[PDB]
Design a protein around this ligand. Structure first.
Ligand SMILES: [Co+2]
Ligand SMILES: [Co+2]
Lengths: 472, 472
């Protein structure tokens, strides 16, 4: 009988994700605003450390499918949840956009987010390249808001506890007010959860604030949450029980209840949590057309491939006849990833790698690369966790005509704000605010159609109470 | 920074529940035999410590809804899973029946179960009265099979770690080959899971075999499983991922994967587990008409009332108009339970207490008691964990005319085998075996209808592949 050191009795902070990541993961970010605002009061009085309610795919979803202005959604939340720390997910130099943007666009986006009420900015990069997060972090500090540097967790031959402790130091070196360990594919097991959270605390000290964001996709992360807390994690992200599990997250009430008697405790009001649970439990059924159909999947521990990525490929394979070659492409991924430097397999890396893996089982190994893949191999998306296969790099140099870069990609981007400003100002509907110019800069394709319909007001693509009853 | 003692690195045994409890909890025990046998080979080679595949509600379900002979199902499993230890759930002196039976019926039932292949018998009692489990345990030892004494976990003012360690000793005192901690309502939290499993091991020694059966109804039991393993639990019950969570159990693959690096390990073959997962993942959809619609519910931690019990009452309340008195009956339960001696709230105690609670909010407090309730208060179902309110006892004595007893109820039951034998032998279809006589003794009402249709062969009340496609 050995022994395990655990942190002193203490409160554990909880961030509620129901308003953003939960519906983004369980119902394709289609959650309408009218189905959320009725819980904002209770959520505000629940006792959460922070409430994730913006950023991520919600901006896209708002203008693309709900005819809703993300900014207006941010202002209503700021108003309905006055005492809460609002939190968002922002993908560094990419913001919530489709590409890297010149620093001047980042400054404004952060600026307006803060100005409209955002308090905590979780800045992250798919490649885990601290340089892509650098300027975003700065803008956040400039606006006097909380800058949370993010480490996208993943499993690979080059990812080690030491490798994560180093990244933490870089994030702190660039002024991170706290470090977020983000595990979107529920790959973080219990021992690793404990060792990593302990290693960071031991190296930079107990005052270092760390927030653990784990999905429940594989079904082992709630145990990791307990281990992270024993290791001393400061805040853990959860989703209200009526909106949890599956590709979602662990249950807030479940994570709050499991601690009774451990010496660890949460600052949550269970009666409030109970109102928020019922609120979404009544609403969720209307979103049945967008739910996933797998509650637990551990396959990723053997294949390194996340369901969303696996399926996306399977379709590409049928849409091209002989898909049965799935077994072949499922074996090419590991090799393609390695070539790219073992980037964490999250959007967009996951589709970039997945797709390329197909063009390797199809035409031939790198006989032809997509423009996106070539861009990763050449460094236009940043630095990889491990050096990329010089061979495949050269091949990309020859197939693209672009030369490899190794410095922060945005270092080559020219000012564009003025160019954006003018362009958006010619679209019917444009209201003149920077907010709208950002909308156009982030979604050039949708900004037009949205600016023209916005006056109609937001909508819902969910079933109506009528459609619901008429179905069953 | 304090420290927590954990058991030495070691293998943890796993019992698969997919074949019995999983479908009993997720799809009203309607799982057809033709939808299970195709996984028996893989399940047999998976590496499970035991495979729960009989007993519980499956006997009833077989003869009542599937026109299937439980005994034939037991013989096919014994044949398709030759190298596995088969396990079942048997409710002591009640067997799988509707009442206590004279010892001679228990002897035969166990006898035939063993003779038809059952290896591990999990004997338990709703009231946790060791005397009701006593003879069943004996019969199991007589037949040279594994006798697992069961402790139904629950939370109440009189249930303590000490109180459970005592029960364990009684179970061992009556020859238990191992102790099963059964938590049907997912009430077992992590610290309690650790303390109880440690207290038992510390008191009777490390060789004492303990199996932990936890449901996932509240969403905190997988963390309890980790704590039980650190405390030294020997075997934990899980359900294959495509048939888990909700009122079900934790995911077998999830519980197997979360241990990597802890020093704890399982003896499971992940590829086999992968075939069993897909097998049930393809079949499960056909049982959609019987699924529950709540994945996580922690309400029971505040109300002591399990969803199934809560709903059952709510219907009784509407079926009697003013149900809105739910808030009243939900407050009477605690008081009614206390009166009965705080019995664990599982079948049948839960309905007996729930119903009576209504007749207390309706007619008046105990103005009228059901015959079942009177029976609990008088002791015809056995001893309660804590002494019953002498007042309410007297009231039952007066309303029933029955006198209170305190000795094992079966001590007053006369031989009945011969009486059963004759009676069943007059039913059209009866095949003459003791097996059939038992069927009649356990389900007098159904034995007739089943004995007459059995020749038609088993059926399925699930959707057909055709009905499935035609629906969506
Ligand atoms: Co997430
Ligand atoms: Co059970």
């Amino acid at each position: 009988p050995r022994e395990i050191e655990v942190s002193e009795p203490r409160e554990v902070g909880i961030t509620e994700l129901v308003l953003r990541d939960a519906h983004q993961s369980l119902m394709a970010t289609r959650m309408a605003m009218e189905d959320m605002v009725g819980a904002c009061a209770d959520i505000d009085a629940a006792g959460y450390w922070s409430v994730e309610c913006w950023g991520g795919t919600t901006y896209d979803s708002c203008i693309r499918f709900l005819n809703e202005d993300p900014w207006e959604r941010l202002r209503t939340f700021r108003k309905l949840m006055p005492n809460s720390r609002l939190q968002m997910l922002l993908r560094g130099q990419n913001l919530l956009g489709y590409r890297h943007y010149n620093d001047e666009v980042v400054d404004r986006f952060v600026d307006k987010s803060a100005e409209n009420g955002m308090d905590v900015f979780r800045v992250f990069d798919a490649m885990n390249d601290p340089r892509n997060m650098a300027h975003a972090m700065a803008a956040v500090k400039k606006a006097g808001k909380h800058a949370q540097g993010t480490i996208c967790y993943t499993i690979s031959p080059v990812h080690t506890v030491e490798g994560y402790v180093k990244l933490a130091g870089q994030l702190l070196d660039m002024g991170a007010d706290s470090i977020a360990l983000k595990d979107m594919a529920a790959l973080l097991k219990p021992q690793p959860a404990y060792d990593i959270i302990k290693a960071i605390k031991d190296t930079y000290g107990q005052k270092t604030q760390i927030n653990l964001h784990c999905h429940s996709t594989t079904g082992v992360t709630e145990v990791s949450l307990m281990k992270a807390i024993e290791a001393g994690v400061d805040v853990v992200d959860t989703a209200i029980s009526s909106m949890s599990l599956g590709p979602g997250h662990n249950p807030t009430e479940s994570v709050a209840e499991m601690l009774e008697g451990t010496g660890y405790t949460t600052n949550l009001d269970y009666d409030r949590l109970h109102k928020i649970r019922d609120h979404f439990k009544a609403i969720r059924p209307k979103y049945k057309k967008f739910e996933s159909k797998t509650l637990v999947d551990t396959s990723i521990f053997k294949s390194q491939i996340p369901g969303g990525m696996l399926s996306n490929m399977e379709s590409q394979l049928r849409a091209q006849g002989a898909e049965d070659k799935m077994d072949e492409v499922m074996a090419e991924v590991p090799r393609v990833r390695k070539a790219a430097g073992f980037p964490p397999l999250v959007t967009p890396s996951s589709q970039i790698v997945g797709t390329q893996a197909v063009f390797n089982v199809m035409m031939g190994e790198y006989k032809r690369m997509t423009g996106e893949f070539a861009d990763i191999m050449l460094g236009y998306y940043g630095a990889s966790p491990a050096d990329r296969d010089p061979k495949v790099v050269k091949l990309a140099e020859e197939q693209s005509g672009k030369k490899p870069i190794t410095q922060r990609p945005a270092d080559l981007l020219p000012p564009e704000w003025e160019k954006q400003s003018k362009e958006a100002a010619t679209l019917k509907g444009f209201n003149g605010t920077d907010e709208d110019v950002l909308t156009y800069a982030l979604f050039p394709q949708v900004a037009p159609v949205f600016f023209e319909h916005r006056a109609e007001g937001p909508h819902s693509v969910a079933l109506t109470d009528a459609q619901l009853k008429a179905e069953a």
